[PDB]
Amino acid sequence: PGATLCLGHHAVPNGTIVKTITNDQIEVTNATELVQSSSTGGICDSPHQILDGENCTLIDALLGDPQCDGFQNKKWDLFVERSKAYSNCYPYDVPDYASLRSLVASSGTLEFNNESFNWAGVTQNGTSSACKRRSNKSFFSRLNWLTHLKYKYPALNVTMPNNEKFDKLYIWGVHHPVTDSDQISLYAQASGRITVSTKRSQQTVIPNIGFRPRVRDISSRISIYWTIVKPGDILLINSTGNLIAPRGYFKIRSGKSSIMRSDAPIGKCNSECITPNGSIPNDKPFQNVNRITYGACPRYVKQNTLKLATGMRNVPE
Amino acid sequence: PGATLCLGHHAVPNGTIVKTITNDQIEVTNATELVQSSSTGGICDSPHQILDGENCTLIDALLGDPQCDGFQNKKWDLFVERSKAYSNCYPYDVPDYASLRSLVASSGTLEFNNESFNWAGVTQNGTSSACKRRSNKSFFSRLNWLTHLKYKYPALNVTMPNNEKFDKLYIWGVHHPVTDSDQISLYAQASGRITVSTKRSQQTVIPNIGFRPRVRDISSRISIYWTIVKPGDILLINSTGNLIAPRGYFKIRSGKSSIMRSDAPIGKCNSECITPNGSIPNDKPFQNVNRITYGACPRYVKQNTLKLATGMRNVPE
Amino acid sequence: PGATLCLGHHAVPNGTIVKTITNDQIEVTNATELVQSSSTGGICDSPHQILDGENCTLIDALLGDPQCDGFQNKKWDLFVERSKAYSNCYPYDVPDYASLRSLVASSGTLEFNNESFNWAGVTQNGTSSACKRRSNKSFFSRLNWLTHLKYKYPALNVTMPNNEKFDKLYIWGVHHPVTDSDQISLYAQASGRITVSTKRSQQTVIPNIGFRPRVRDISSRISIYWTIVKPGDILLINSTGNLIAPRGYFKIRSGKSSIMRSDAPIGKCNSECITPNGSIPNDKPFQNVNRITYGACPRYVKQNTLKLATGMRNVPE
Amino acid sequence: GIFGAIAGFIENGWEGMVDGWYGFRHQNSEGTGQAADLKSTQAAINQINGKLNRLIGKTNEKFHQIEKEFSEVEGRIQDLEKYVEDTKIDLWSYNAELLVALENQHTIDLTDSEMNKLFERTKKQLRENAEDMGNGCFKIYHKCDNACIESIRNGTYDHDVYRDEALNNRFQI
Amino acid sequence: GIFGAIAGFIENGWEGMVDGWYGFRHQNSEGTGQAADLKSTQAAINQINGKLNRLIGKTNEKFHQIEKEFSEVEGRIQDLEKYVEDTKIDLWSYNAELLVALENQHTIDLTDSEMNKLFERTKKQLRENAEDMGNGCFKIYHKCDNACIESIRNGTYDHDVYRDEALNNRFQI
Amino acid sequence: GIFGAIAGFIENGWEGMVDGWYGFRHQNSEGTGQAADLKSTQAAINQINGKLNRLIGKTNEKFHQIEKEFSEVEGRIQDLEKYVEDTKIDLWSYNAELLVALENQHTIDLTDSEMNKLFERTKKQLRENAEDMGNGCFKIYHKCDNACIESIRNGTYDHDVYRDEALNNRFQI
């Protein structure tokens, strides 16, 4: 009689279809998903330092818009900018806005140090009804609106040496009045001109008198500029009118900081990978949640599923 | 005696050489080419909507150069710009020309809507011998050259609200006269200044009096600018001279439109993939015709041939 | 009795660990390194034409700083800029410095041809104590500082046609004086304005009077601009003051030239691949020495070692 | 599939084998049985775990990058930002597609390989005492009780013990 | 080549086999013949068609992109546009090169595999009635007429019918 | 490893084989010996040299590119330059990683293949005159002196010369 001895392998009733080089659909005993396609819907507040902008864009927090005083000197790994954010101060623009936003985002700090600029012969601390604090007229906290003193505005020729071991970021501006009579009422001379320089750079800006559409009842504008001052260099501001002066400098750091646009709520939880949709698990190598990411994240791909076989071909009975 | 039974495989007299991991030349029974290396030499007019620029650059069709009136309000998937195209109007430049060209190309439409700007107190519709229609003096169709009326040019302070559901693209310019006496002859005051603004943006441009090399007997220049106005925003133009005014706005759309430089003839045929060399078949995954493509196209690679084996090793008798 | 015949394979006492698809550590009999991780520490002077900038940036060699006269008309494949390089002439800036540096680097030549500009009615060849040659006052060799002649500066309206078969690169500048009295002392009128044009382009620059921090005892500045003039086109310079005039043009070529920042010594040796760390062998497909490369170089990767098996699995006795 | 055992000469798998991936079924004069083979099972699992160790829990940290959505039309610079990102995503999407296709082909082949190797190891062990029926089963030409079957499964089967019996049965008339 | 049949133990291919990719040649006492094997032929073709289905007729639509030729010298921005494009093209050129090398290696191996599998399936079917001559041919040790040869080719050959005859011929002196 | 010879049924390699990669050890009534097999050795070497020819001495020339280090903070344009370069490096680093993993897997498999092919070629040559002991060794059932062993190694062994002797020894009782 003898015996029979058969060699064989397992199978499962419920196999999984995968793709191969020679076949787009072959059933294997088991597989695992390589594309993360879901989020929790919230941004976990750990382990990255999250700063929710709430009503404030980064730039409004920088300049010191009245809704943003709580942000002074704060740091972040990720600044979260909300779609509802709006400005509630003097109407302004920033030539190169995207670059200023980027460089502050990447620096990751609003640390500010006041400095004693000698604004000899002018009136300081100008304010406006377009920028209220507690119903008083106010202005951007980090800027100083200079105007005539007893109908004179003597030329400004002011120096600030950088004797620190770090770089300084100065934010300053030019006021563009609505009319010639407004120019004279504020600065006591028919035009201004502003030249801000260091040993290695210079910027001059000309005010441009004219009407723009009223925003918070203001038809004038302020245009914002910036200057970085290296250790051993010197900031020189020279102007005859229309200067929106710096009150000091911001620290500029380097590191892992960034900014993200999202309306996702912040939650008390821990997740390494952040997207605008919310935090996502980072076990898988790929994800199709969002091209925009921060942290240790799977790589964005177009596919919504990629199944890696983790077993043999399934050959059911 | 018994029998012999031999197992074997086919071969062909005419095999094809392919590359592998271990050998740069091995003969297989058959292969297929993966790199498209030829074109028809013509651009098929189907299935993409093709607009042949003929003598007109896109920007000249936009501004309304006299050779381009047939282009008014036309749309395209692909605007084809010819190397022979030349301007036949007032000499102009466009700071950022590449961006204006790009954004109009991508929008895919020249749809224009006239608007009734109140140019109170000035002469409208200025023309030049450098921009003829039918031997008459003329100008860019979409622009309005304003000049003094009875030796006065009262300040312009003109508004146009966007009460539409779509964005508006405004094209406007500044005239740079050749001389101080030309400045006065045209505008009745020694300089101009133009500020064009919305609630969220502003541009001011200063005319610059001086000689440039004569082009169509003109040593002055026009510089072209643009402004996008969102729904609920307002265009404000404020100027005292030298304004080359908009006549209305262009629609700005989003979609699949583009622009391509090519001298290939347009043919009556159907092909999905366009290159500057002409349309190409798109069966193959790769092509080495041109890095510049539009439509469903194979991917550009440096190789001129890549043979995929479609049969076994060829082992001839 | 009979015989025994065993089939087998070699092994070595000293195998090498490699990575595979299924195992991060498997021992094979032999392997070869695919990542170049070391340099010689020097830049070989062959086979690329190397130009050591020594004390001169490319831009200082271009303008003709007094430390750079030995560079006149020289060509390179690779211009090597040293971290110690410093300027020793009139303090200047170049808006778009990076682009001018890049386009000259890529052109690969400082070939300069003098041209006879008719600067009718002004004093030529101005000099300064901030730009000495051999203790005499001097200036940038390729630029011509124009000033009043007998307290007049008649308007300049000067033409230079390009009747060559090649493009011309013109370098020119504007002088920004420290004060209104300096403006008058130099140019005999309260402002200047400079318009440099061709048939297809125009640039106008306004001098900006004011103090900048003293550099080599100078608080004024020069700002440098450039203009490319095509065959059949014409350079037109029109100015009433503050022009730092061109003395002629640079040839602009196209080819394989570039620039690299490095402090590596130049050696008498032959190596195709240059990095800032020094030349590297180029036998391997990858390298982790530097992302910055010039010549026939392995591709930069993050890994510091990648071992390719060149033998079978090692199964020692 | 490249070796031809799984989905090949082995007609189908065994849904009732739940303690291993490969193994043995027998019939002899004491009954029938199934037993997993640990070596082959662990060889396949180890290889697949090797793939997983390279792919799971291995992400790349990135921080400040470029913007990838835009509220305004800008032209040249934005065209470039968008094209860089689209380029990157398409290259990564290709890498992911190829990775899974290649890895899956190889997993199917290596698991087939492990089945084949177990078959070959058993074939050689049986020497002249059995014949391959062509479907992964051997006809054993001698009495082979439960201990005998276990000796084959555990590598202690001595073919010489049974060879006279087997040859007589095989080469009978 | 990794299995060793095609360009290996099979000395060469058959230019006169035009109705299949793999098959059988025989000699017996009624003559000689050739016949294609459909199963193995279709197995190879199906796999190659699988590759083609992933590569042919599968293009990506792109519309407005960046400029890639320039009439003027500009510096920094143009340097970046050119480098992005050169980067992209080199990565795609690498992908295309590797794809074809890998796919071709695999096609040669899988076709060799299908030849080997046909050989193995025939070897097992013949049981003790034939011997492998080492060149893809079996010496069959019994009378095997045309119907007998067709029974081998179609999987109905009953080795037990011929076994006594074959053993007598094989183990003669 | 996918064929199962190297690190499989061949227990270990031979450190004392220094004139080839694969070969033969024997024992017979005149002593013991080792000899390299040139064909199999050269087949493996040629394939590995094929890989090396595609990877060594094949660099790409690049000249003027983009800047990759920056002395000043700038924002948008520099962010883009840095991201393009970081993107490129990560894609190339991935390509290098996968290339070496895939190539190494394949080298291990192809070398195993060449061992297996040599084994199979010897097995077939010996016909009914030897049995596979399961560890890469054949028991040869006839007197096989040095010239006889060399005839096997050089492909001139005539199995018919020894077949009567071998069958008598194999199928004894």
Ligand SMILES: *[C@@H]1O[C@H](CO)[C@@H](O[C@@H]2O[C@H](CO)[C@@H](O[C@@H]3O[C@H](CO[C@H]4O[C@H](CO)[C@@H](O)[C@H](O)[C@@H]4O)[C@@H](O)[C@H](O[C@H]4O[C@H](CO)[C@@H](O)[C@H](O)[C@@H]4O)[C@@H]3O)[C@H](O)[C@H]2NC(C)=O)[C@H](O)[C@H]1NC(C)=O
């Ligand atoms: C089909 O094939 C897949 C892949 O092989 C199998 O999935 C694995 O299953 C095992 C067993 O359940 C898992 O092992 C467990 O992992 C847990 C952590 O996993 C999380 O995090 C990783 C990333 O780090 C993710 O990939 C994963 O999806 C999870 O989000 C551990 O916490 C578990 O620990 C348990 O056992 C240990 C034993 O020491 C104890 O210390 C613990 O207390 C605890 O009880 C465990 O190690 C493995 O994670 C799975 N991998 C994947 C990729 O999903 C399937 O099981 C298989 N299916 C079938 C039917 O066979």
Ligand SMILES: *[C@@H]1O[C@H](CO)[C@@H](O[C@@H]2O[C@H](CO)[C@@H](O[C@@H]3O[C@H](CO[C@H]4O[C@H](CO)[C@@H](O)[C@H](O)[C@@H]4O)[C@@H](O)[C@H](O[C@H]4O[C@H](CO)[C@@H](O)[C@H](O)[C@@H]4O)[C@@H]3O)[C@H](O)[C@H]2NC(C)=O)[C@H](O)[C@H]1NC(C)=O
């Ligand atoms: C070497 O190997 C290659 C690849 O396998 C073989 O090439 C294939 O050959 C077949 C048979 O001729 C082709 O099948 C035919 O395809 C036609 C459409 O092809 C065009 O478009 C595709 C992209 O969609 C391109 O890849 C291709 O190059 C062509 O431009 C069909 O129109 C044909 O239809 C015919 O038969 C059907 C049967 O139902 C009828 O409906 C029709 O009326 C018509 O008569 C047909 O299906 C296949 O396209 C080829 N592939 C490729 C990639 O080229 C070679 O044949 C082979 N050579 C040898 C000697 O064996």
Ligand SMILES: *[C@@H]1O[C@H](CO)[C@@H](O[C@@H]2O[C@H](CO)[C@@H](O[C@@H]3O[C@H](CO[C@H]4O[C@H](CO)[C@@H](O)[C@H](O)[C@@H]4O)[C@@H](O)[C@H](O[C@H]4O[C@H](CO)[C@@H](O)[C@H](O)[C@@H]4O)[C@@H]3O)[C@H](O)[C@H]2NC(C)=O)[C@H](O)[C@H]1NC(C)=O
């Ligand atoms: C482990 O595996 C590796 C890879 O197969 C082996 O390395 C090869 O070894 C051979 C023999 O030594 C080398 O062949 C020699 O190459 C020299 C040039 O090599 C340089 O340049 C290449 C790039 O072009 C680099 O890859 C390499 O690293 C070197 O920098 C030749 O000059 C040699 O010529 C000699 O022999 C010829 C014979 O005709 C004569 O003409 C000459 O006079 C001279 O004497 C020689 O051809 C080969 O370069 C090596 N390849 C690599 C990639 O390194 C190891 O040998 C092997 N190790 C073991 C223990 O087996």
Ligand SMILES: CC(=O)N[C@@H]1[C@@H](O)[C@H](O[C@@H]2O[C@H](CO[C@]3(C(=O)O)C[C@H](O)[C@@H](NC(C)=O)[C@H]([C@H](O)[C@H](O)CO)O3)[C@H](O)[C@H](O)[C@H]2O)[C@@H](CO)O[C@H]1O
């Ligand atoms: C210097 C001054 O007082 N000028 C008077 C004009 O401001 C005024 O025009 C009206 O201004 C209204 C709002 O006024 C403020 C403001 O922004 O709140 C008052 C501020 O104190 C003043 N700030 C400073 C530092 O002087 C500020 C400033 O003048 C403007 O913002 C500059 O554009 O104005 C509101 O905008 C009205 O719509 C506008 O008519 C006129 C007429 O009353 O008289 C000027 O003397």
Ligand SMILES: CC(=O)N[C@@H]1[C@@H](O)[C@H](O[C@@H]2O[C@H](CO[C@]3(C(=O)O)C[C@H](O)[C@@H](NC(C)=O)[C@H]([C@H](O)[C@H](O)CO)O3)[C@H](O)[C@H](O)[C@H]2O)[C@@H](CO)O[C@H]1O
């Ligand atoms: C306003 C005016 O008529 N000015 C006279 C100058 O134009 C004129 O200079 C000559 O101008 C010649 C061409 O003249 C036009 C033109 O471009 O065709 C005539 C146009 O009507 C005029 N357009 C408008 C809206 O006024 C236009 C314009 O003045 C210039 O283009 C602006 O630069 O000029 C041609 O260019 C000659 O070469 C040039 O001398 C002088 C001398 O006749 O008298 C001015 O009164």
Ligand SMILES: CC(=O)N[C@@H]1[C@@H](O)[C@H](O[C@@H]2O[C@H](CO[C@]3(C(=O)O)C[C@H](O)[C@@H](NC(C)=O)[C@H]([C@H](O)[C@H](O)CO)O3)[C@H](O)[C@H](O)[C@H]2O)[C@@H](CO)O[C@H]1O
């Ligand atoms: C035109 C002139 O001579 N102006 C006098 C001022 O230069 C002078 O201010 C002092 O200038 C000092 C250095 O002087 C030079 C220089 O750079 O070496 C002398 C040069 O000849 C002159 N170049 C030309 C082409 O005229 C040059 C030029 O004026 C300035 O560089 C422009 O900014 O100046 C040094 O900077 C002193 O610190 C500064 O006070 C004043 C006072 O002596 O008198 C002016 O007449």
Ligand SMILES: *[C@@H]1O[C@H](CO)[C@@H](O[C@@H]2O[C@H](CO)[C@@H](O[C@@H]3O[C@H](CO)[C@@H](O)[C@H](O)[C@@H]3O)[C@H](O)[C@H]2NC(C)=O)[C@H](O)[C@H]1NC(C)=O
């Ligand atoms: C130049 O043109 C602009 C735009 O048309 C003119 O601005 C407009 O000025 C009027 C008059 O002050 C503004 O009206 C005000 O509206 C507010 C808000 O309801 C109200 O509180 C005031 O009592 C007043 O009615 C109007 O808002 C403003 N429009 C825009 C779009 O800014 C400007 O007056 C013109 N200048 C001259 C000198 O004509």
Ligand SMILES: *[C@@H]1O[C@H](CO)[C@@H](O[C@@H]2O[C@H](CO)[C@@H](O[C@@H]3O[C@H](CO)[C@@H](O)[C@H](O)[C@@H]3O)[C@H](O)[C@H]2NC(C)=O)[C@H](O)[C@H]1NC(C)=O
């Ligand atoms: C850069 O800073 C300097 C230094 O303060 C400024 O120069 C000074 O400007 C003032 C005002 O324009 C000048 O005073 C005026 O002089 C005229 C003529 O005598 C007189 O009519 C006025 O009543 C007034 O007194 C002063 O002379 C001048 N000083 C020097 C050394 O030149 C300059 O204005 C600043 N530049 C900018 C752009 O702000």
Ligand SMILES: *[C@@H]1O[C@H](CO)[C@@H](O[C@@H]2O[C@H](CO)[C@@H](O[C@@H]3O[C@H](CO)[C@@H](O)[C@H](O)[C@@H]3O)[C@H](O)[C@H]2NC(C)=O)[C@H](O)[C@H]1NC(C)=O
């Ligand atoms: C400032 O310099 C420019 C450039 O040298 C001078 O422009 C030139 O002006 C002359 C005189 O009008 C132009 O000549 C004209 O040529 C046309 C075409 O053949 C002809 O029809 C006229 O009868 C006349 O001959 C010349 O084309 C023009 N050159 C360029 C390059 O634009 C300009 O006159 C100078 N201004 C002063 C005030 O000196």
Ligand SMILES: *[C@@H]1O[C@H](CO)[C@@H](O[C@@H]2O[C@H](CO)[C@@H](O[C@@H]3O[C@H](CO)[C@@H](O)[C@H](O)[C@@H]3O)[C@H](O)[C@H]2NC(C)=O)[C@H](O)[C@H]1NC(C)=O
């Ligand atoms: C922005 O639009 C406003 C509103 O029209 C312009 O302001 C107005 O400009 C005109 C002309 O410059 C001024 O009239 C002039 O007044 C002077 C001084 O009395 C007189 O000598 C002239 O004969 C003429 O009458 C007008 O006063 C002024 N209006 C206001 C409310 O300031 C302004 O010019 C426009 N800006 C630009 C850049 O175009």
Ligand SMILES: *[C@@H]1O[C@H](CO)[C@@H](O[C@@H]2O[C@H](CO)[C@@H](O[C@@H]3O[C@H](CO)[C@@H](O)[C@H](O)[C@@H]3O)[C@H](O)[C@H]2NC(C)=O)[C@H](O)[C@H]1NC(C)=O
């Ligand atoms: C406007 O502000 C600037 C910056 O504070 C003033 O520049 C400074 O001017 C003084 C006086 O000439 C310079 O002093 C000189 O230093 C050199 C070098 O040791 C020495 O050789 C001279 O004898 C003199 O002491 C000082 O260097 C310079 N500072 C900077 C940072 O540039 C400028 O004077 C002010 N203008 C007015 C009109 O007040």
Ligand SMILES: *[C@@H]1O[C@H](CO)[C@@H](O[C@@H]2O[C@H](CO)[C@@H](O[C@@H]3O[C@H](CO)[C@@H](O)[C@H](O)[C@@H]3O)[C@H](O)[C@H]2NC(C)=O)[C@H](O)[C@H]1NC(C)=O
């Ligand atoms: C562009 O080049 C032209 C041609 O030289 C310049 O135009 C000329 O400028 C001068 C000086 O501004 C003018 O002469 C002056 O005339 C006034 C008024 O009669 C007088 O008070 C002065 O004493 C002097 O004589 C000349 O008339 C004028 N020529 C023409 C044809 O307009 C122009 O200045 C140059 N532009 C630039 C930006 O440099």
Ligand SMILES: *[C@@H]1O[C@H](CO)[C@@H](O)[C@H](O)[C@H]1NC(C)=O
């Ligand atoms: C197989 O071949 C034999 C011999 O010609 C024939 O009788 C039989 O019908 C065939 N069977 C099948 C299933 O094709």
